[model samples]
Structures are given as C-alpha cells and as structure tokens.
Target: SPTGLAGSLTNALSNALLAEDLLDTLENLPLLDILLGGLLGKVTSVIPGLNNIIDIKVTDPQLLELGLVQSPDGHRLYVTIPLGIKLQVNTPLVGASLLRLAVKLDITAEILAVRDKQERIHLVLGDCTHSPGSLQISLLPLPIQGLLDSLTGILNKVLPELVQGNVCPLVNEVLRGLDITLVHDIVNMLIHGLQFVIK
Candidate 1:
C-alpha cells in the first residue's frame, strides 16, 4: 500500500538523475555510489534515521497499489522510478527502514515531476522534530559537459561543510582519474525511465 507521497519521491529521484537524454549524458558507473551518498545525506537530515538503515535495497519503480491524488486536464500526471538503486535509511530500530527508503524514492520522484522540476530542486518535507521524514533529490539540467558544474553546485548547497573542508580533494580522492560526464549519464539513464508530466 504505497502512499501518494511515496510515488512523488520515486519520480524526483529518477528525474534528478537523468533529466533529459538529448544531452547524451553518460554517468560514471563508479561515481554512482558517492553521488547516491550525497543525495541520501541531503534528505537524511529532513528524514533522519536513514543513515543507520539496514537491509537497504534498490528497486525498479512499480505502480503496484500506487495511485495519484490529482490530475491535469482530466489526466493522471505522475511518474515513478523503479527502486533499482537503494540504500539504508534508518536504524534497525526504525523497523523496515529498507522498505521505507525504497518507498521513499517512489514518493520523491512523483513530487519532483509534479513540481515541474524547479526551485530548490529536491524536496525534503517534514521538520526535524516532527516526524522529520521526507526527502527528494533534484538536479538542474545541464549540457553534457556541464554535469560536473551541476554536481559541484549540489555539493555547495547541501553539504557546504564538505566543500569548505576541501570537497574537491575528496572528489579527487575517490575519482582520482575518472570521467565525470560518464558519471552524469548514469543518472541520465535512470531519469530517462520516468514519464514526464506532459509526456
């Protein structure tokens, strides 16, 4: 029984990764883990307990038992990403954190598409004290070569501390000698799987 919120989350994550294929984006296969880490961390604050989560699993977005709460021009406007890439979002104490994280993606994606991919990009609902459970990953579309700049912007916004502490040094450490465009495209492929609100 997935909720309306869950569906949006899925779409947002999917779109944040690959907004458009026309750019010929190709994500760096290895960079997936780190980028995922950044996104997971960004939302974790709004949606805590996501860090110690256990049995994390990625899934391909599915419409099973999923529905929409609104429509445009007498049509359902929403997109979902398969929970294919997953991560732990809560401590075992939270109970079913793995399922929660996977479901979170579904909800996040839907919301992103519904929002028309603007503003803060990713959406993190709920406050820290009250529930504090909601997160969305978003991206600003960029040219094939602008991928790095986009990610750099993300690092600047979400985790300023990391950037101030020499983030580039860290990116250099892990991606010692890799192609960034390829990394960007991997996400591009993920977003490509989504159904645009208009299309």
Candidate 2:
C-alpha cells in the first residue's frame, strides 16, 4: 500500500506541475498540448539514428553567481565536447531539448565520447576524456514518445484540476508521497510553511 502509482513513460520522471495563476489564465483557452520543449524541441518520429542524448552532472552550480566564471549574465559554464563527438541527429527536437535544459540547469556537459561496440541498444556510463569519470547517455531507446505522452497527460489533466485547486496541499501530496530521502521530515516543514496562511 505504501508503493505509489508507477509510470511506464520515462523511468524516473514523475509529472509536471504548472503555476496556479498560469493555469487559471488558461481556463477559457484551449488546453494546447505542449511539450516542455527544451531538452529536445519536439519528438516526431521513432527514428533510431537521430536520437542524441546530452548527459549532465551537476559540476558546480555556484559559478553563475560568483561572477569570477566567464558566465556572461545568464550564460553558465561551457562544455568541451570532444573533437570526435558527433553532432549528428535525426530528431533535432531531442538535441534542442538537451541544449535548452543544459542552459537552464547550469550544466557544462562535454561529450568525452568513448563508444562500446558490445552495446547496440544500451550503453553503460563509462569514463571519458573530459570528466575521466562522468556520465554518458549515448544510446537511446524510442521511449521519448512515451515519456512525452505521460508528461502531457499529467500536465493537461491532473495539474490544471488537482494542482490548481489547492497547490500548497497538492505539492504536499507529491512531497508526502515521494519515495525520496528525508521526504517525510522535509514535508513536515513544508506543511508548516503552507499553514502560514492559517495563523
């Protein structure tokens, strides 16, 4: 009974939560099914050769605020993608999305690409030139479509209704129900924060 609803879309992604004010503005407007198109602009096909995944690890998020780093205003660290790194992709959407998310998250992802011939479908995260010990997501299955479907479903249906109704409590549900470390205690504080409106 403790186990919550599992999604078959992306292995890790849960769902989307929109700001309540934003949702309220869209009440009369059509629920335009939109993708969070930054990682990849839009995924259209089940094409195999075109899938490009940018693996990111949080190196140093503090560089942006310090002003010592050459992060011009909002721009963050630079990723030194190796000379041999292939920039080809069948789905431009996926590549665009990765780039977008990279900028948003302040990650400097250099593709120190070393391939494994044994892995045709899946590739394990191995050592590379830049990180020498980093994360790599080279190969991909055609699960992007399914992930989009699940995310869109949550955005269109659940968020506008359930989340919009009582967002503080809605976040508490996600926080309470999450299977994360220190979730319960952290959520206790969050519940206290939400109850600030009471007293």
Candidate 3:
C-alpha cells in the first residue's frame, strides 16, 4: 500500500491547482526575485579574445509563462522567464564599461515523488534543463561599439551556457529545499477541503 499511497499523493498533488492559479500564485511570491538575486550575485565569465573578464548581473526577472503537465510516469513544470542582463566589461581600452542585454530563459523540470525507507513520501527533483532564448544588446559608443560587436559575438556563444550552468543549479537547490509539509499545506489550501494523507 505504500507504493499505492505514493502514486495517489503524486496524482492528487499534481491535480490540486489549475495552471493559471498556480502561475498567479507563483508570480505573487517573492521566490523568483530571491532566486534571481542569488543568481546575479557573482555570475562572472572570462572572455578569450577580449582578454578581459565580464561580470554578468541580472535585473527585472519576469515570468512570462508557466505550464504544468502530468503523465503516468511523472510531472513536468515549464517556466519562461525574461531578464535584463548588465554586462560590466573591464578592458584595457575603456578601463570599465557597461553593456545592456535582454535575454529569455526557458526552464523545463521534472518533479518526482519518492518514498523513503521510513515510508515517508517526499518530492525530489528529477531532471531539469535550461534553454536560452533570443539575446539582444543595446547601442553603445562608436569605439566601444566596435569592441563590443566582437564581444557580442563571443557573448552570443558564451552567455547562454554561462547562465544555464549557474541558473540550473540554483533552481535545483531551491527545488531541493522545498519542504514537503509546506507543499502539502499549500496544496490543501488550493484544493479547499480535498485532503491528501501523506504517509
């Protein structure tokens, strides 16, 4: 019955809230702001040809779309977030300069329900993937613009991977930290009297 209980819990939790309501609740929460703040703390990458280090910082993270899909095997969460990135470029030429870029990130994550040896049911992260969306840079001064054009090409290749590496881990960390009890409470509240007894 433990296996049956796990399956029932997962099924009930997945269907607890409508996608629109879940997205609205997520948007109202400060969760993304906190995550983005942690992400921008020290996202730095070295550019080869420029022979300079670029520091990438994020601002204004917007959740454009969110989706939740359930299957017999597992459930998947899809998130589309658009962010403004500021690249602080320190070169021998300009000493230190700033560049503005706009980019979007698409995240797909699988949610897993597991039963421990103690027969306690908990949620765990299965697999997560980050996809880079369109990237656009702002206009800059002539001299710096020329330098940046090449840098932009480099960024076009490097930025997405850099962001993916850092962002995915942060997301995993957050997902791992989710308290099952808290989630159960949230699900209960969302469903209004529909109760899930998690063994």
Candidate 4:
C-alpha cells in the first residue's frame, strides 16, 4: 500500500565523513573568499585601534589552496593565505605610522562536531595554529609610538586568546551555512528495505 520510501540521513553523512579524505588545490574557489573575508572582517573590526585609525588600506588577499582530511577525533583543515598589510597612523605628535607586513601563512585547524541546544550539529575548531616565516612590526615617529607601544605588549599577550574566541563563533556559522554537494561514481548499489510502485 506504501508508495514512498522513508529513511534517516545521519548515518549517510557520518559514513561519508569517516571514509572520505577530500583535497582541493584548484585556484579561485569563491567559497574560500567568503570564508576568508568573514574571518578578516570580523577579526580586524575587533582590533583595538584599527577602526579608530583611518586612511588604512587593505589590499587583495589570495588563497593558494584549501583542503580537508578527517580522523577519529576531528576533521583537519589546511590552507595557504597571502596577506600584504600596510598601515599609517598620524596623531597630535605629528608622527605617522608606516609599516608593511608581508605574510605567507600555512594555516591548520582541527574541527569537531558539537550539538546545539536544539540538537543541531555544528563544527567547533578545537586546535588551530600557524607558523609563517616572517612578520614585520615597526612603529614610526616615537620609535616606540609612545602610548601605542605601551599597549603592544598587552595586545601581544591577548592576541591568541582573542582570535580563538572570535573565530569559533564564525566557524559555527560557516558550518551551519554550508551548501554541501554529495557526489557519486557508482555502477551498482543495493537497498534492502524499500517499497515501490510502477506507474
């Protein structure tokens, strides 16, 4: 009497995640720009004096490649980002900030699935780290930039914790917003429990 099939998809995704190791090296993935832009915008906006200082220009960012690998504990994400950050700040002291930071970062993060209050799943970044060969920091006018320099040590101490806290929320947002596409290259398959009607 039944003409339709009903089933659960949780096992389907869990199985896929466990078995598949996805890798992508193609350039110009639009998704990369969206993620990176979200990260950059959210992070930069929170930085103390960055918004206060005007006339700073952020150039284009490049994502060399992005990939994902899965393990028992979590999923590992890896990417390369190139950033050229230049800043200039001027104040009553007539000192203008001039610093150019060129960075090539190989970033990695381990993400785990956690449920929300409503039992919906989201990805939380458990472990994240990066090591770039060089990062240049220089202050003009006061050499130390006076007040700004004093805040530098404090900022340095807070950066790791600050960034982690800010981005995790964004990660969850991104996870929930994914437009995932499931693919197949199958020749044959079998399903045991089913009901069908020929029309």
Q: Rate the local accuracy (lDDT) of all candidates.
A: 0.30, 0.27, 0.46, 0.33
Task: For residues 25-66, write the lDDT of model 3, one tens digit per residue.
Answer: 322333212226334344432324342234434444444434
For candidate 4, report its TM-score: 0.36
TM-score of candidate 3 on Cα atoms, chains taken together: 0.47
Position 172, candidate 3: lDDT: 54
Candidate 1 whole-model C-alpha lDDT, 0 to 1: 0.30
Worst 10-residue stretch by lDDT in candidate 4? Answer: 182-191
* Global Cα lDDT for candidate 3: 0.46
Kindly report which residue pairs in candidate 2 clash with one another: 38-97, 39-97, 39-98, 40-93, 40-97, 41-93, 50-90
State TM-scores per candidate: 0.19, 0.15, 0.47, 0.36
Which is superior by TM-score, 2 or 4?
4
CA RMSD of all predictions: 19.6, 22.8, 12.0, 15.0
lDDT of 2 at 6: 20
What is the C-alpha lDDT profile of model 4 across 1-199, one tens digit per residue? 3222111122332233223311111111121122253465677568664443323332333333334443432222222222222233333233464433222333444444455689554444566554233233444323544545533443344433433343334333443433332111000010111222111
Model 3 pairs whose backbones collide: none
On the 0 to 100 scale, the lDDT of residue 65 in model 4 is 32
Runs of candidate 3 with Cα error greater than 4 angstroms are 1-74, 90-99, 114-120, 132-145, 184-199
Ordering by TM-score: 3, 4, 1, 2
Q: Ten consecutive residues with minimal summed lDDT in candidate 3?
A: 26-35
Candidate 2: residue 135 Cα off by (Å)? 32
Give Cα distance to truth, residue 31, candidate 2, Å. Answer: 18
